[PDB]
Design an enzyme around this catalytic site. Sequence first.
Site, PDB file in Angstrom:
ATOM      1  N   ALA A   1       0.781  -1.326   0.023  1.00 57.85           N
ATOM      2  CA  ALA A   1       0.080   0.081   0.075  1.00 57.85           C
ATOM      3  C   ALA A   1       0.811   1.221  -0.093  1.00 57.85           C
ATOM      4  O   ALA A   1       2.120   1.095   0.369  1.00 57.85           O
ATOM      5  CB  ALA A   1      -0.964   0.097   1.167  1.00 57.85           C
ATOM      6  N   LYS A   2       0.415   2.358  -0.469  1.00 58.86           N
ATOM      7  CA  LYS A   2       1.138   3.721  -0.318  1.00 58.86           C
ATOM      8  C   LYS A   2       0.014   4.748  -0.235  1.00 58.86           C
ATOM      9  O   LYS A   2      -1.176   4.641  -0.936  1.00 58.86           O
ATOM     10  CB  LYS A   2       1.891   3.876  -1.515  1.00 58.86           C
ATOM     11  CG  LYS A   2       2.632   5.310  -1.465  1.00 58.86           C
ATOM     12  CD  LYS A   2       3.790   4.814  -0.521  1.00 58.86           C
ATOM     13  CE  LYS A   2       5.297   5.069  -1.032  1.00 58.86           C
ATOM     14  NZ  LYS A   2       6.278   4.389   0.081  1.00 58.86           N
ATOM     15  N   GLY A   3       0.373   5.628   0.749  1.00 61.62           N
ATOM     16  CA  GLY A   3      -0.563   6.843   0.812  1.00 61.62           C
ATOM     17  C   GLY A   3       0.176   8.156   1.253  1.00 61.62           C
ATOM     18  O   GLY A   3       1.255   8.266   1.036  1.00 61.62           O
TER      19      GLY A   3
END
Lengths: 413, 407, 414
Positions: free
Chosen positions: B97-99
């Site tokens: 994931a990446k945010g």
Amino acid sequence: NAMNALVATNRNFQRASRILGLDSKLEKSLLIPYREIKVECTIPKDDGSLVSYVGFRIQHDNARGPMKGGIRYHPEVDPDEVNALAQLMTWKTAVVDIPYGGAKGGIGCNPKDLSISELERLTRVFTQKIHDLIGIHRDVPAPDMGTNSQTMAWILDEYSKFHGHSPAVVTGKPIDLGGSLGREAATGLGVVFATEALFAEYGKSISDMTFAIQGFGNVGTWAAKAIFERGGKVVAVSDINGAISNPNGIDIAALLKHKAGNGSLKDFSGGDAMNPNDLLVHDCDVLIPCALGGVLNKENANDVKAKFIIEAANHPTDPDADEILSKKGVIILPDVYANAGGVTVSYFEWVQNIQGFMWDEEKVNQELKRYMTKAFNDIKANCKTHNCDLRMGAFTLGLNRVARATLLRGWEA
Amino acid sequence: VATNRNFQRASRILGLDSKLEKSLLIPYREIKVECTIPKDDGSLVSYVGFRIQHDNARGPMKGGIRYHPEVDPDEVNALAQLMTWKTAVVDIPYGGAKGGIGCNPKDLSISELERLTRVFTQKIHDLIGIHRDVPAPDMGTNSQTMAWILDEYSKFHGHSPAVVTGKPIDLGGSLGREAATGLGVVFATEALFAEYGKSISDMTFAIQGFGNVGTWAAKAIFERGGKVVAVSDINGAISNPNGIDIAALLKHKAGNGSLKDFSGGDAMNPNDLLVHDCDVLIPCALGGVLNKENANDVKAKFIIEAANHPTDPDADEILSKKGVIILPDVYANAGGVTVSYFEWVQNIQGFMWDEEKVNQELKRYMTKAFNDIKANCKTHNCDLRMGAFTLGLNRVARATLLRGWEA
Amino acid sequence: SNAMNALVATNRNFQRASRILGLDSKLEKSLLIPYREIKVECTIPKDDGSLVSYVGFRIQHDNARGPMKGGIRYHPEVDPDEVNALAQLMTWKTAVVDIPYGGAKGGIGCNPKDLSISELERLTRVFTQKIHDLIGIHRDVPAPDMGTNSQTMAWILDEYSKFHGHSPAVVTGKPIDLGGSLGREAATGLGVVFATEALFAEYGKSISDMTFAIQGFGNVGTWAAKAIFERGGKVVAVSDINGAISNPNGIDIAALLKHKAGNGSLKDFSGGDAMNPNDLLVHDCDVLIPCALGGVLNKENANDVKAKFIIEAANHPTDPDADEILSKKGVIILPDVYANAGGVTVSYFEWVQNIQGFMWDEEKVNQELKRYMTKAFNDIKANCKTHNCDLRMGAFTLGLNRVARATLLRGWEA
Ligand SMILES: NC(=O)c1ccc[n+]([C@@H]2O[C@H](COP(=O)([O-])OP(=O)(O)OC[C@H]3O[C@@H](n4cnc5c(N)ncnc54)[C@H](O)[C@@H]3O)[C@@H](O)[C@H]2O)c1
Ligand SMILES: NC(=O)c1ccc[n+]([C@@H]2O[C@H](COP(=O)([O-])OP(=O)(O)OC[C@H]3O[C@@H](n4cnc5c(N)ncnc54)[C@H](O)[C@@H]3O)[C@@H](O)[C@H]2O)c1
Ligand SMILES: [Ca+2]
Ligand SMILES: [Ca+2]
Ligand SMILES: [Ca+2]
Ligand code: NA
Ligand code: NA
């Protein structure tokens, strides 16, 4: 032929309660299951037409912890059978002193008649219908007859839609989905550890004996393999489709390779085809039932040749057979101990999952050996203080541990 | 563009079918949320926060939160997908994931950054979680950012230390975290070397970069008898053919000294570092430093990619022709993400480990990962970079296929 | 209302440590206010069907460092200020030994001797019904205290689990058969000895070098005396408050243990000389260990103490006047907030074992206990050097600073 499964198990429970002198009111509480669930499981077949089954989950006792027990896909699954198996899980978990209660589930179906996509849909629908009732700290399923690690992957996947990623909700998982090293082989290997503990008392080794084995699935294959490797002479093997024998020993490794290539037992070249109906009464030193329950009964018990019976299957010997066999000098290592290797390593799988960190295979196997050794030592001592046979020594050991936990918890609302 | 071609090649090496491939490229879930806060003077500012949850077949997702402007969705997606492969390479039970938040944190006060972090957490509180998606620091965020996420998240779900990693030690962070990437580089190098029968104590090393990764790697190499003959950073460089005293050098950096003004060596042109005479070259600082112009002048026989993408594909081929072995970034710098897993484990078990246990578990994970990569390389007759990529990709594929597709 | 031994010690010590640290006054105010105070009506039918109504309560003082932790007292004297002080003290104590909890304290204002076992069980289950959403494995974890025991905890566990599923870690002090930890009975006394070993190492001495006088022969005194005896310490006097025995050659603690087992009293014991239990604290010895009672060291007897070391196993044996006189005499006092923390440390271990789903053997519990106690002493010693203070303030400043740091890192914005 077969005595009612729940009549048979309740007769052993009554015999064990009398040894312990249980009060009748406490006894009645411990007998009645905590909860019984029956749910409609309707799926479309691959051609779109509907089939409807009934799924069962019997939750027998949870005084000692979350409930534990497998799921059977078999056409003779019914409330009596699931109730009897669930009660036996309550005693078995307590025998090996793992912090679980007893449960069991199943669907009355024949998996050979369903496609793999139908089996997946049925498994997911069943999970949808019981997702509220099972849980990491509530009730933790596992495989049994007619299910396997792929079945458990589907249970995990569907359950996690409702409650989030929950590896510990089911055991017997594939390694690549949080399963434990050593779990696939655990029941068969534990049978061997239990058999070694017993033979030590008589001064015998596995390599001294001949063996006949009924059933050749997850339990019977691993049990035969483990026996074969330790020098035991496996002289007959049956499954649902046929059987094979060799009085000088079957090359089990070769038989397993032949099986993995879709060969049938009867066609294996290193043995003689036999009628599977002659397996339980075959000449051998040790008989290991690894299939259905109730198969040793008043009608065939007098024709058993074995001096030892190791109960790898659940309740393969009914109380009528127990008494006949006792009078023939036969020794029976009871199911609630001898086949507990599976649920013991299931406990370790569950522990690894809730710790979020897996163990190496050597630790799983070290702990299995320690649990199986301790349980046998406890049974031995219990048979002494109570002066009873092995089945009752194990049964009273587990029942007394369940009673203790039940009494500590109390009964006010 | 090259990323899509690379994924296709790895997929075809593994024999994945096109339907599975297409599924693996679609993110599980993409989220964008409004994040509006009052500034210290009471006037409003509005930002957009986001989280790309790429894949969760192997476990909860994991990945950084970036506070940085000029957000590019394609790049965020690419980085989330990379974390899915990276977690699988070292066999930790997470997906990728990446945010982030599209903001410039230099323009916000510390109280504004706190409010913005808490509002973002309010907006995503049911989509992150200990067994769902576990954020971490990244560009523009740090352990204080994580502390605020923990504190606000726990209002919604109770005290949940494992909901983020990179926490301050005083709030459940792991010992060994600062050194994890640099030390993991060295454990990875030791595993690579043992496969060739070599030992750090008989090698010389040149290191590009002397920050969080370069300092700890140099220290760990030096403590194992490696000869660090050259080191550079952004301002200068220092060389000593007999080995730099790295303990002395680290003392001099602490007192605000420069590399070139260090007395235990000769100052050198930092542009000369990658072509310096050594056995082992470790780019630690910058990506894209090895290209078709300089790769023929590299003298090392081993390149350890601590930095991300230091070597372009031209250089890869040139260096392979020269018989240089390149330990790929996706594996070699994975000690940080591996210790972040250990942080989560310690949190879930309610019981922290001492630093020796963290580092032994790190060495264990890095060593096993190398051996798995090498075995995969033998299976597919490929180099380490593709061997690492196909290992991770195949583990994700396998978990996905076991889970199945019926509703 | 505002005046028992634990209230005065804690707020004296909090204030003194806050000034040593230079804490900001607004942070200090926040640390003093409890997170949450709960009172709930607990009404049950007696065995005869008639009603009785009690008030149950839980003071949740601080949770910056983790779930709160603390005992449940079934006792009719409820003094709100004393309950608050004890919850606050648990916040500092957990921080001193670096366990990831904050402090709480609760109970029910009742006299458990007036209630049947079935009544106590209904009362416990109703209390649990009333606070089920305010306690929890990662929220607040009760334990036994005055008037409650492991059976009480079993009932809380059972009733709580109806609301949230099997939750063994929701309480500590459980029966072994329901997930309780090995090593619990010995934990406080053994921890006292581990703490004493660490302190003496700082002087390059060992327990085998010393003579000991022990006040109290209950759970703490017996296990501390046993563990000192087994390490070669010479226990020259023991009091059980009703009697006392003196032996300059060292009392045979094993013999004395068997004698207490045969329902004998201290004054019954033949392996020593008659002594006045009121003279225990001024008995000749190298090391004095008050175990049973608080307030016993005061301005009138402090100067007659002969020990070089005092190990505060009991809660609050030394009043402020005595603490000062004794420091001026050169006496080293290992403070109660640290020295008797073995019990709460092993209760932390029980929670860990439950959360991990797998119980430890006793050897492991005791290795971990020694590790926690030893590391805490070294941390206290470091703090004493940093702030140039005595062991008591080294401990309180260590725990207060850990709570302050966690509070400041978590922050204040909504
Ligand atoms: N799987 C476990 O972990 C585990 C643990 C303990 C006990 N058990 C018990 O062991 C027994 C077998 O379980 P399994 O997991 O091996 O099942 P499985 O589905 O893997 O295999 C069952 C085997 O029994 C054979 N069989 C079925 N009906 C038969 C018949 N009438 N005659 C002869 N063979 C027949 C099947 O053909 C197959 O070889 C059951 O009683 C089960 O409850 C299983
Ligand atoms: N855990 C981690 O820190 C981590 C994880 C994964 C990848 N990486 C990779 O490692 C790199 C370095 O991370 P870090 O934490 O060490 O960064 P850092 O900011 O702590 O240190 C960077 C170092 O690079 C030097 N540098 C910058 N530009 C240079 C140039 N042109 N020539 C020579 N030296 C130069 C700086 O002066 C400094 O010495 C990242 O940029 C990334 O490529 C880091
Ligand atoms: Ca019952
Ligand atoms: Ca809007
Ligand atoms: Ca407060
Ligand atoms: Na303002
Ligand atoms: Na009554």
